[model samples]
Target: ERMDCIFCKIANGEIPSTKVYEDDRVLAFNDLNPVAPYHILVVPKKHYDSLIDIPDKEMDIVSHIHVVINKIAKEKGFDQTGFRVINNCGSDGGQEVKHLHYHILAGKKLPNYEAGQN
Candidate 1:
């Protein structure tokens, strides 16, 4: 497990989480403080500090993560309604954890993006 990484602990089962999905390559769980009606966080079992830290050759793992997300959405009754997948790259990008993760937020009307809005 990666030292001092909350996600690593969660993936290792050292920290308890409401698991959404799990597999050889990824561990996905519900967010502790969810902003949406249905919010999930997907993290790779192997450590990667951020999106840029991931090597191009291993990008298939990232694709697999999204695949799991889609399956979860369908099972959770949000697929037909649509959802959003987000990866925050760094501190400035609003990433709370240094460990690489993707946020799957759905099941409600999300705020629409405006070109000039903060």
Candidate 2:
């Protein structure tokens, strides 16, 4: 694990977080600065700089994260209403934290992209 990474510290219990879900391989917590009424972050316990940094053999962990997101959405009452799951990759992708993580955002109508619009 990368000791300096904030996500890793949260997964390792070195940092405090409002946890939603956790297991041997993954950690899910509420976002500190939420954009939606229900915003959560799903991160792997193991350190990974970004999605591209995940090893091929450990891809199952990524799938598990999605499963957890689905479960959370249902429990939080947004399953049928809909939600958005985002993974900001690199600097160009708007990734702030170095550690890999997925943002599960829901609970309201979110802005959508229009064709040929910035």
Q: Candidate 2 at residue 8, lDDT?
A: 88
Tens digits of per-residue lDDT, candidate 1, 70-107, equal 98998998999989999999888888798989999899
What C-alpha lDDT, on a 0 to 100 scale, does residue 71 get in candidate 1? 89
Give the lowest summed-lDDT range of ten residues in model 1: 109-118
- Model 1, position 84: C-alpha lDDT score: 90
Overall lDDT per candidate, in order of appearance: 0.90, 0.90
TM-score of candidate 1 relative to the true fold: 0.92
Clashing pairs in 1: none
Q: Alpha carbon lDDT of residue 74, candidate 1?
A: 89
Model 2 lDDT on a 0 to 1 scale: 0.90
